Design a protein around this ligand. Structure first.
Ligand SMILES: *[C@@H]1O[C@H](CO)[C@@H](O[C@@H]2O[C@H](CO)[C@@H](O)[C@H](O)[C@H]2NC(C)=O)[C@H](O)[C@H]1NC(C)=O
Ligand SMILES: *[C@@H]1O[C@H](CO)[C@@H](O[C@@H]2O[C@H](CO)[C@@H](O)[C@H](O)[C@H]2NC(C)=O)[C@H](O)[C@H]1NC(C)=O
Ligand SMILES: *[C@@H]1O[C@H](CO)[C@@H](O[C@@H]2O[C@H](CO)[C@@H](O)[C@H](O)[C@H]2NC(C)=O)[C@H](O)[C@H]1NC(C)=O
Ligand SMILES: *[C@@H]1O[C@H](CO)[C@@H](O[C@@H]2O[C@H](CO)[C@@H](O)[C@H](O)[C@H]2NC(C)=O)[C@H](O)[C@H]1NC(C)=O
Ligand SMILES: *[C@@H]1O[C@H](CO)[C@@H](O[C@@H]2O[C@H](CO)[C@@H](O)[C@H](O)[C@H]2NC(C)=O)[C@H](O)[C@H]1NC(C)=O
Ligand SMILES: *[C@@H]1O[C@H](CO)[C@@H](O)[C@H](O)[C@H]1NC(C)=O
Ligand SMILES: *[C@@H]1O[C@H](CO)[C@@H](O)[C@H](O)[C@H]1NC(C)=O
Ligand SMILES: *[C@@H]1O[C@H](CO)[C@@H](O)[C@H](O)[C@H]1NC(C)=O
Ligand SMILES: *[C@@H]1O[C@H](CO)[C@@H](O)[C@H](O)[C@H]1NC(C)=O
Ligand SMILES: *[C@@H]1O[C@H](CO)[C@@H](O)[C@H](O)[C@H]1NC(C)=O
Ligand SMILES: *[C@@H]1O[C@H](CO)[C@@H](O)[C@H](O)[C@H]1NC(C)=O
Ligand SMILES: *[C@@H]1O[C@H](CO)[C@@H](O)[C@H](O)[C@H]1NC(C)=O
Ligand SMILES: *[C@@H]1O[C@H](CO)[C@@H](O)[C@H](O)[C@H]1NC(C)=O
Lengths: 115, 49, 98, 261, 454, 49
């Protein structure tokens, strides 16, 4: 007999109080507007789109959610801009200038000692 | 010490908390008693281990 | 409270149940601290390795000392951790040639 | 694993008894969730190391080197190389739930095909900035220089090195048609899930293993003590499961850190 | 009329001071955004506590009445407040059906057996509940259709009364020269305390999915993301049972209408063992004059399972039917048929005229009159030897002090009830050691599909 | 380890009751075997170069 977790998707209480709900691996005919079927369950309260954005809130199986277009919407995730390299059999590209960059990396080293 | 049912051990010291005029004792986060009110003198005392 | 309202023959059983339960709590706690301490130890080993190879020298290892071509790094202290300031060389403004 | 359906299994007498043990289920859910989130992080750190999705030119021909067995083949399930097809072709109970990965296999194939296009058309330049094109024969000459071999040794033997490379790649499919390091992970977890289920037929010092049995024929005061023995024994099994998942999760993370490096 | 509450009916669940601590509590509250009845009067139910708000600068509400019957012959609570102060009182009253110079108090006309005494625009809120014989009142008077806001209510009284309540009324000050009624339900809230120790906000943990997230996280501010808060569980409907057909029927059918029964001194013993026995044909027949079911109840005969069943049959007089019982005495119990002291079956007897009587006398039925020593339980004698009451042997010849031991019943139809023949069938169940035998039919049954069912 | 010999120590009453707990003695053996095989693999990969 059907059963599964229930998760709540929120843009943050400092943005809005709208919410969508995912019923994990529940068929959309056995749940009891905007109902969207994903391989992870049924998503209700989120408008599905065709465009593709950067992932914000990960849902699963390639589906993410975002607060953009306001109620709350869904969409697929984009791996990143597309670019063709201008390859040929006698062409080269060489830089004529440069920049110096600085980046951070953070690593933990210890915990509190308990007894 | 025993304060009308509240049984415990510790050092009693003058507090700086302010109970509501119906509350006998206080608890800390994680729900352990850390202050009581003396039934006779009506003063709030902290309980430290 | 068990003793206050019960005889010893039966109080030994009730206290033994509580002891077993709370002793299981301690076993759970200590087992997780050992598993989690191995993870912070692996992180401290990585941080010590970068301290040697990114700060005390110049590395050719790709992406080990930041993004770009490693020039130098400066350490900073953080609470329970370390922060690395990675200085890299990045080319810009290419032209094509035959 | 849902702790309530494992331990009690749709039983209201048992469900109320779970309230006397405190927050054990809180620990169980967090322990398994905390290591489930890392599993998607492990795959992002290995494959999502490129910002752009690079493509190769249609004129698949590089100084004589034949890369058609490692590049996607526009005529297959989804979009795999002929060699990746060998790799993928060779390899709701009572709460025990399996969650899907965040990245699908089609999404991983698209990360690996972008890495392949970058290293063939752009060498090692796309990993330090913009992708810079250079002809492939000249990339291989640089690579010989980096190991102590002069570059004229390649250019006067270019046909030999291309013939040797092309045969060497073609031998890979014979060796694949190996993967025990991947099959062991699937088998070890499957055996742990099966063992967890089988501990639901132990008495743990009770008269019956079935909760709808004890309480029904016995005496409530006694049924409560025997059901608590079943709860304790099944909780210990479930806690053992979680401890071993944390110990195994560290081994997968250690391997994923090496694969990313 | 009805109105919509907003966040009302929140009271301090107990003593115990507290500081900045998002504490979670379970208790009897008025749910947020609830459906509260409106009155401008009739006896209202209680069922579990009451919320009571009102609005008015003057004082129209002049006490309440509580209890189980709201009448005399039993004790009740009465709360009034004149221009002095509140007066709690618990007596047996006699209330006016319409209770209400400047003279007043025409509410009751009796105050017997008092067990408790006490003496001493605008929003006046109250919370009433009654738990373990304690009648609690919370209240607060805050100056300004109700508005919108939050305000926690503090304890007012502590009353060790013992009183039961199922209904109550209200009292109003008439003109001679507006109130709300909610009820409480078991809910869970997440309460926010300030540094002074007062409740400043709350979350109803059984309303909106966002509130369930707040309650699980123990916060009133949730950061953007996705949170697992609960679970979905489909529930089964109906109870489908499905047992086999039937087959046999354990032929009681022929034991009860056999065309001849035996004399009481030579009774019968049928032992049905391999059976599905349906005692409904027996119980729902009911022409019976006696039915004494001893060890087991006449209703639970269709849910047990024994190893053997022994059914006896004989014919006796009417005023001898009372001797068929565990522990007895008489010519029938001692010499003819004795039931043990630990009998676990059940005797059933019915009148048998028109099939046993005979105009002229039916001497076919006999019984034993003289025996040396009483019988044993479930023993049967058929001896025809001549009893000897004297001191001389008679050598199997009747005469003086030597009697024939078997006399006869002379059943005629023009007898009196209590001398007419009765057919008796005593049943006896036992479970020796065999791990299956006769037991009744399960009961109803059916089937369905494509539905989550039990 | 030989599970039965530690817990019961060759006693038929205990060992028959021990069967009522399922297969804990199979898990113990698998766990010890899995780490005892890796001890030779660890040495083999350091020196067989
Ligand atoms: C070097 O030349 C190549 C073409 O051989 C340039 O790539 C072209 O760039 C334009 C402008 O972005 C695109 O519209 C064309 O589609 C590209 N051609 C191909 C075949 O991809 C490249 O931008 C040039 N590099 C510089 C620095 O100018
Ligand atoms: C390389 O890049 C830098 C900018 O990053 C150029 O320096 C700038 O040059 C402009 C004039 O073209 C000046 O107005 C700016 O003040 C310079 N910036 C700085 C920080 O000095 C530099 O000229 C570039 N080199 C070439 C050859 O184009
Ligand atoms: C690169 O190798 C592939 C095989 O891996 C070659 O494809 C084969 O080509 C021959 C000749 O046309 C066919 O008989 C085979 O059926 C092809 N195999 C497949 C799987 O299609 C390909 O021709 C080679 N490319 C170059 C430029 O030589
Ligand atoms: C270097 O070795 C390779 C073999 O590894 C030689 O190439 C082979 O030469 C034989 C004899 O001419 C041919 O039959 C094979 O077909 C060649 N193999 C390939 C893959 O082309 C090569 O000749 C050697 N070079 C020198 C200078 O001796
Ligand atoms: C016991 O036997 C009598 C007769 O032997 C049964 O009477 C029968 O009743 C049914 C129901 O009306 C009739 O169809 C039959 O014709 C009757 N029998 C005769 C011979 O006419 C009586 O029903 C039997 N007892 C039970 C409980 O069935
Ligand atoms: C959060 O709220 C603060 C005000 O309290 C505001 O300044 C800030 O922009 C908000 N953040 C977002 C992401 O909306
Ligand atoms: C849900 O059930 C219907 C049939 O009632 C089926 O057509 C549909 O594919 C199911 N959905 C999923 C996700 O399995
Ligand atoms: C998305 O595009 C498909 C065709 O590729 C179309 O059938 C569908 O209606 C579109 N969805 C929306 C929401 O417009
Ligand atoms: C309250 O419920 C009653 C039915 O019991 C309904 O008639 C009434 O409209 C409801 N009130 C509100 C404010 O919804
Ligand atoms: C107030 O009411 C109580 C209860 O009837 C009564 O005992 C008391 O005398 C009243 N006070 C005055 C001033 O009438
Ligand atoms: C209650 O009052 C009645 C008279 O009305 C009296 O008979 C009875 O004894 C009283 N009960 C008590 C407990 O005083
Ligand atoms: C209240 O009524 C219940 C029955 O509804 C009864 O069992 C109980 O004893 C009563 N309580 C008191 C204090 O009389
Ligand atoms: C209690 O808090 C209020 C603000 O909510 C403040 O105005 C008042 O001064 C405080 N009083 C005490 C004793 O802390």
């Amino acid at each position: 007999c059907s059963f599964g977790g229930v998760s709540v998707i929120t843009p943050g209480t400092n943005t809005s109080n709208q919410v969508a709900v995912l019923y994990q691996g529940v068929n959309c005919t056995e749940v009891p507007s905007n109902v969207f079927q994903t391989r992870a369950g049924c998503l209700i309260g989120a408008e599905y789109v065709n465009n593709s954005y950067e992932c914000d809130i990960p849902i699963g199986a390639g589906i993410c959610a975002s607060y953009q277009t306001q109620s709350i919407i869904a969409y697929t995730m984009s791996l990143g801009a597309e670019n063709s390299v201008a390859y040929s059999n006698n062409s080269i590209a060489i830089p004529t200038n440069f920049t110096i960059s600085v980046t951070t990396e953070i690593l933990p080293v210890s915990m509190t000692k308990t007894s | 010490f025993n304060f009308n049912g509240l049984t415990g051990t510790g050092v009693l010291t003058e507090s700086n908390k302010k109970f509501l005029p119906f509350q006998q004792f206080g608890r800390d986060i994680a729900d352990t008693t850390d202050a009581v009110r003396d039934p006779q003198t009506l003063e709030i005392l902290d309980i430290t281990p | 409270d068990i003793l206050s309202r019960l005889d010893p023959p039966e109080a030994e059983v009730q206290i033994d149940r509580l002891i077993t339960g709370r002793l299981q709590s301690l076993q759970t706690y200590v087992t997780q601290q050992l598993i989690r301490a191995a993870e912070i130890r692996a992180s401290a080993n990585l941080a010590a390795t970068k301290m040697s190879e990114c700060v005390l020298g110049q590395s050719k290892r790709v992406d080990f000392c930041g993004k770009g071509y490693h020039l130098m790094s400066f350490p900073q202290s953080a609470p329970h951790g370390v922060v690395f300031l990675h200085v890299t060389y990045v080319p810009a403004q290419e032209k094509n040639f035959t | 694993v849902d702790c309530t359906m494992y331990i009690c299994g749709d039983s209201t007498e048992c469900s109320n008894l779970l309230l006397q043990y405190g927050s054990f289920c809180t620990q169980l859910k967090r322990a398994l969730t905390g290591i489930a989130v890392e599993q998607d992080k492990n795959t992002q750190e290995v494959f999502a190391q490129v910002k752009q999705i690079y493509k190769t030119p249609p004129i698949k021909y590089f100084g004589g080197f034949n890369f058609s067995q490692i590049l996607p083949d526009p005529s297959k399930p989804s979009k795999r190389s002929p060699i990746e097809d060998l790799l993928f072709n060779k390899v709701k109970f009572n709460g025990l739930t399996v969650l899907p990965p965040l990245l699908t296999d089609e999404m991983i194939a698209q990360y690996t095909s972008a890495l392949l296009a970058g290293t063939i058309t752009s060498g090692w330049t796309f990993g330090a900035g913009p992708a810079l094109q250079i002809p492939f024969p000249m990339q291989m000459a640089y690579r010989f220089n980096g190991i102590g071999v002069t570059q004229n040794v390649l250019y006067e033997n270019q046909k030999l090195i291309a013939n040797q490379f092309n045969s060497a790649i073609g031998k890979i499919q014979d060796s694949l048609s190996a993967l025990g390091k991947l099959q062991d992970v699937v088998n070890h977890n499957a055996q742990a899930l099966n063992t967890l289920v089988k501990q639901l037929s132990s008495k743990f010092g009770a008269i019956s293993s079935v909760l709808n049995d004890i309480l029904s024929r016995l005496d409530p005061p006694e049924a409560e003590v025997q059901i608590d023995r079943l709860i304790t024994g099944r909780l210990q099994s479930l806690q053992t499961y979680v401890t071993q998942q944390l110990i195994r999760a560290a081994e997968i993370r250690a391997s994923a850190n090496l694969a990313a490096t | 009329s009805y109105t919509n509450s907003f966040t009302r009916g929140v009271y301090y669940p107990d003593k115990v001071f507290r500081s900045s601590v998002l504490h979670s509590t379970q208790d009897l509250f008025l749910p947020f955004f609830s459906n509260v009845t409106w009155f401008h009067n009739p006896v209202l139910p209680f069922n579990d506590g009451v919320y009571f708000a009102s609005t008015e600068k003057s004082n129209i509400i002049r006490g309440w009445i509580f209890g189980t019957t709201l009448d005399s012959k039993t004790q009740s609570l009465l709360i009034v407040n004149n221009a002095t102060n509140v007066v709690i009182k618990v007596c047996e009253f006699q209330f006016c059906n319409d209770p209400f110079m400047e003279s007043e108090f025409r509410v009751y006309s009796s105050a017997n057996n008092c067990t408790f005494e006490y003496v001493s625009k605008n929003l006046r809120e109250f919370v009433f509940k009654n738990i373990d014989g304690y009648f609690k009142i919370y209240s607060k008077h805050t100056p300004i259709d109700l508005p919108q806001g939050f305000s926690a209510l503090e304890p007012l009284v502590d009353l060790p009364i013992g009183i039961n309540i199922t209904r109550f009324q209200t009292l109003l000050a008439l003109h001679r020269s507006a109130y709300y009624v909610g009820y409480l339900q078991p809910r869970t809230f997440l309460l926010k305390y300030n540094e002074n120790g007062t409740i400043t906000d709350a979350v109803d943990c059984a309303l909106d999915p966002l509130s369930e997230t707040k309650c699980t996280l123990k916060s009133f501010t949730v950061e953007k993301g996705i949170y697992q808060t609960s679970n979905f569980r489909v529930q089964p409907t109906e109870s489908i049972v499905r047992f086999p057909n039937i087959t046999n029927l354990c032929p009681f059918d022929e034991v009860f209408n056999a065309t001849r029964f035996a004399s009481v001194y030579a009774w019968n013993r049928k032992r049905i063992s391999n059976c599905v026995a349906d005692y409904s044909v027996l119980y729902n027949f009911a022409p019976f004059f006696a039915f004494k079911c001893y060890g087991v109840s006449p209703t639970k005969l269709n849910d047990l399972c024994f190893t053997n069943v022994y059914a006896d049959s004989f014919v006796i007089r009417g005023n001898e039917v009372s001797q068929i019982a565990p522990g007895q005495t008489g010519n029938i119990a001692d010499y003819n048929y004795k039931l043990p002291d630990d009998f676990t079956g059940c005797v059933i007897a019915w009148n048998s005229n028109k099939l046993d009587s005979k105009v002229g006398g039916n001497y076919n039925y006999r019984y034993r009159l003289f025996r040396k020593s009483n019988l044993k339980p479930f023993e049967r004698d058929i001896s025809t030897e001549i009893y000897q009451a004297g001191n001389k042997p008679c050598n199997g010849v009747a005469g003086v002090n030597c009697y024939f031991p078997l006399q006869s019943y002379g059943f005629r139809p023009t007898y009196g009830v209590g001398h007419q023949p009765y057919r008796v069938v005593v049943l006896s169940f036992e479970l020796l050691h065999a791990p299956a035998t006769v037991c009744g039919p399960k009961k109803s049954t059916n089937l369905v599909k494509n539905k989550c069912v039990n």
